[PDB]
Amino acid sequence: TPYVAAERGYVDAVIMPHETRAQVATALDTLRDKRMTRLPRKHGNIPL
Amino acid sequence: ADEKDAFDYVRMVLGHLPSNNMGDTPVFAPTAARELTEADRALDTLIPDRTAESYDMMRVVNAVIDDGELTQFHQLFAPNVICGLARVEGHSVGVVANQPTHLAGALDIDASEKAARFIRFCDAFHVPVLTFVDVPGFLTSMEQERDGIIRRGAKLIYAYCEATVPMVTVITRKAYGGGYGVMGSKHLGIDVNLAWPTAEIAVMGGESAVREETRERLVSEYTETMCTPYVAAERGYVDAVIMPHETRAQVATALDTLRDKRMTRLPRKHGNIPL
Amino acid sequence: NLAWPTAEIAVMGGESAVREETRERLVSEYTETMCTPYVAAERGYVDAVIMPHETRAQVATALDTLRDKRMTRLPRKHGNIPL
Amino acid sequence: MTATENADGRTRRRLDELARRRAELAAQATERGAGRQHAKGKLTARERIDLLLDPDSFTELDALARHRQRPYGDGVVTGYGTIDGRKVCVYAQDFTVLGGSLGEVFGEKIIKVLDLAIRTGCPVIGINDSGGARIQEGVVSLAYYAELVKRHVAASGVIPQISLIIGPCAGGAVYAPATTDLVVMVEDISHMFVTGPDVLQAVTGQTVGMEELGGAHRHNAVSGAAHYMA
Amino acid sequence: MTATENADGRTRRRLDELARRRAELAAQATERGAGRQHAKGKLTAR
C-alpha cells in the first residue's frame, strides 16, 4: 500500500487518481524557482 | 587473488591519485635518468617487419613509465585496449593503449566504454592522459552495430574532446580510418602528438586499397609510400616524427612543458554524453 | 564580413603590380580578374558577396542574428595596448 | 578639364558577374544531380533547409566557398534562419555535389556555423546525407570529422543539437550525430553504420542488407542510435 | 609452420628514412642560404 511510505514522509501525499493533474500542476508552480547546485567539479564520472 | 592483494591494489591506486579534485597529486622522485638505456633502444626494433605480426603493447608502455609499473584498471575486460595509472618522472599519468595481441587492437563497444570512463576519471582528478596508438579501425561483426557501437563507441571520442588535462599521444604503428581520429588525435584537443617512423596513418590500409597472382607486394608498396607519418607531419597534425628510442624523453619533456595547462569548458550544468 | 562585387581584395593594386606606351589597360585588366572579392569568398574570409542594394537588409539581419553573442577575453588585470 | 571620363560599364559588369555566379548556383536545382536525388525519393539540401525553416528566413554562409573540378559550396549548405520565429543555425550535406563527401572546405563551413550557434546561444540542426570521406584529401578528411565532433562535445548541454539522417552516414562520421542530443532518421531512405555490409561480408562471410544493418527502424528499435523514425 | 617469415628490413628502412630526412634538415646549416645570411653579418634562425 502507499501508507507506510506516507507515514514516513517518503511520499508527501496520497491522492485520489483524479487529483493527479491539479496536484502535478500545483507542485510544478510551487517548485518553479527551485535553486540547487552540485558540489563544484570539472565533471562527474557517471558509469558508462 | 585474495583479500591482501585487493587491499594492496587499493593502496597502489590511491597512491597515484590526489585526495580530492582540488588537491595536489603526490609527486615522487624520478626513478631513471633521461639518458638512453637498453630499454629505450629496444623500441627501435620492436615493430615487426611483417604486416600481420603483432607485438605486446605493454612492452612499449613499460619502457616509458617509471619502474615499468602500470597499475591497470579493467585489465581482464576488453583487453584489446590497455588502461592504467603510472608515473613519468615521479608524476602521475593515466595510460590508454591499443593492444595488438587481442582482436588485432581494433576498437569495439567494450574497449570504447572501458577507455572512455578511464579517461573521464583521470581528467576529473587532474591526471594527464598518455595514449599509445596502434589501431586498425573498428571491430567488424554483425553484432557490433546491433549492440550499439554508434552510441556506445561515441563515448570514447567524447571523453578525449572533454578532457582539459595535459595529453600526449604516441602513434607506434597503425592509425587507420576512424581509429586515427578517435585515438587521442590532435583534432580532439590533445596537446602533443608524436609519431614513430613506423606510424601508418591513412584513410585505409593496403589490404583494403587493392580493389604470382596472389601477392603482398602491391599492398606492401602501398603501406610504404602511402601509410606513413609524413603527411600528418607536413600538416602539423603530429608535432614531431621521433625515433622509437626517443619516446621516454619526449613524453617526459612534453608532460613537463604542459604541466600548467589551463583550459576550461564553456559553462554548463553538465554535458549530455551518449549513454 | 560582406563584400560588394566591387570589392578589390589583394596584396597590391594594379598600379603597383606593373613593374600607346602609357596605358591603364594592363592595370585595369589586373584590377579586374585579380582584385575581386572571390578569392576571399572561396576561403570563407568573407561570408557572402552581396549586391550593393542588399547592404541594409544584410547588415540588419546579421546584427539581429549576432545580438546575443557572448565572448570573454582571457582573465587579466588589464591589457598592454601600445601607447 | 579635370581628369578624364571612361564611358566604362565596369561597375555594372561587376554586378552582372555576381548575378552570373548566382545563376550558376540556382540552375543546379534542375540539373542532373538534383534529378538523381529526386529519383531516389530524396529532397535536395536546399529543399530541406527551405522546408524546415520559416519561409524566407534562410541566410546562407559561404555559398561561394571552394577548394584550391571545383564546385561552389564544397558539398554542404550552411547558414541560419528561424523556426517559429526563434533563431537557429543549420547545415545540410549536399549529396548532389561530390557526393557530399567531407573535405577541408566542407569541414570549415560546418565549423563556422557550429561556432556561430555556440557563441550566439541558439540551437543547431544538421542534415546528413553523404557518400563518405573525400578520399583524395586523405588524412585531411579524417581531421575534419574529428574537429566537428570536438565542437559537438563543446556544445553538449550548452545549446540543443539535433541531427537528421536523410541518406547515408557511414564510418567514424557517425560519431558526430551520436554526440548530438537527438538523431532523427527517415524510413527507407536513410542508413547509418560504422562498418558497411561489404566489409562485413568480406570479414564474416555473412550477407546483410543495408536496411537490415543500419536502416531507420533498426536504429530506432534495436541499437538505440536514433530517437525518431519519420 | 605458423604464418611465414619475411627477412625484410622494413622497419629498419623506416628508421633510416627518418634519419635521412633529419640529415637534410641538418645539412642546411652549411648550405648556400646559411652562407649568404652569415655574409650579411647575421646568425641563422637555428
Output the CA–CA distances (angstroms, integers) from residue E15 to B39, B230, E34, in the order listed: 17, 13, 28
Closest of D222, C72, C35, D185 to residue B147, by C-alpha:
D222
E10 three-state secondary structure: helix
Helix (H) or strand (E) holding B173: strand B167-176
3-state DSSP assignment of residue B12: helix
Task: Measure CB to CB from residue C6 to each of D11, D64, D87 and give the nearest one.
Answer: D11
Closest CA to D129 of D180, D161, D176, D95: D95
Secondary structure in 3-state letters for chain A:
CCHHHHHCCCCCCCCCHHHHHHHHHHHHHHCCCCCCCCCCCCCCCCCC
List CB contacts (< 8 A) between A39 and chain B.
Answer: none
Judged by DSSP in three states, D133 sits in strand
Set of cell numbers at residue B91: 608524476
Cβ–Cβ contacts within 10 Å for residue B18, how many? 15
Hey, are the CB atoms on A48 and B155 less than 8 Å from each other?
A: yes
CB contact under 8 A, D143 and B161: no
Crossing angle of helices C25-34 and D10-27, in 10° steps, is 30
Q: Around Cβ D117, how many Cβ atoms within 10 Å?
A: 24
- Gap between the Cα atoms of B3 and B26, Å rounded: 26
Residue corresponding to grid cell 533498426 = D218
Determine the residue type at D188. Answer: D
Nine-digit cell string for E16: 633510416
Alpha-carbon span B133 to B115, nearest angstrom: 13
Q: What angle do CA B124, B135, B251 make, to 5 degrees?
A: 55
The single-letter DSSP state of residue B191 is S
Would you call C44 an interface residue with chain D, using a CB distance cutoff of 8 Å?
A: yes
Give me the helices (H) in chain D, please: 10-27, 32-39, 45-52, 104-120, 139-155, 175-179, 197-204, 210-214, 216-218
Breaks (C-N over 2.5 A) in chain E follow: none
Q: Quick check: B145 and B123 in contact, CB under 8 A?
A: no
User: CA D223, CA D114: separation in Å to the nearest integer?
Assistant: 27
Say which residues have a Cβ less than 8 Å from residue B68's Cβ, sequence separation at least 6.
Answer: B39, B62
Encoded amino acid at E19, one letter: A
Coil/strand/helix, residue C39: helix
Task: Report chain A's terminal Cα–Cα distance, integer Å.
Answer: 35
Distance from CA of B18 to the nearest CA of D (A): 26
Whether B120 and A41 lie within 8 Å, measured CB to CB: no
Beta bridge mates, D133:
D102
- Say if residue D185 is exposed, middle or buried (CB neighbours under 10 Å; 0-12, 13-18, 19+): buried
* Minimal-distance CA residue of chain B relative to A43: B124
- DSSP H helical ranges for chain B: 3-15, 38-41, 58-64, 109-124, 142-146, 149-162, 178-182, 217-226, 230-234, 247-257
Q: Which residues of B touch E24 (CB under 8 A)?
A: none
Core vs surface per residue B181-217: b (16+ CB within 10 A) or e: bbbbbbbbbbbbbbbbbbbbbbbbbbebbeeeeeeee
Q: What is the residue type of C33?
A: T
E14 and B197 within 8 Å at the Cβ level: the answer is yes
D96 within 8 A of D33, measured Cβ to Cβ: yes
- Count Cβ atoms within 10 A of the Cβ of residue B264 and give its class: 0-12 exposed, 13-18 middle, 19 or more buried: exposed
CA distance C68 to D87: 11
Distance, CA of D162 to CA of B53 (rounded, Å): 43
Rounded distance between C-alpha atoms, residue D59 and residue D61, angstroms: 7
Q: In this complex, do C41 and D87 lie within 8 Å of one another by their Cβ atoms? A: no
Cell triple for B273: 554524453
B-chain CB neighbours of E7 within 8 Å are 49
Contact D158 B140 (CB under 8 A): no
Those residues with Cβ within 8 angstroms of residue B108's Cβ, 6 or more apart along the chain or in another chain = B78, B80, B138, B139, B144, B149, B153
User: What resolution does the deposited structure have, in angstroms?
Assistant: 1.6
Length, in residues, of chain D: 230
| Contacts with B, D 134-193, CB within 8 Å | 135, 138-147, 149-150, 153-158, 171-175, 178-179, 181, 192-193
Nearest CA-CA partner of D76 in D100, D48, D111: D100
CA C28 and chain centroid, separation: 19
Place of cell 589551463: B262
Other C-beta atoms within 10 Å of B39: how many?
A: 15
DSSP state of D167: S
Q: Are the beta carbons of B181 and D146 separated by less than 8 Å?
A: yes
Cβ pair B50:E11 closer than 8 A: no
**Nearest residue in chain D measured CA to CA from B162:** D153
Radius of gyration for the alpha carbons in chain B, expressed in angstroms and rounded:
19
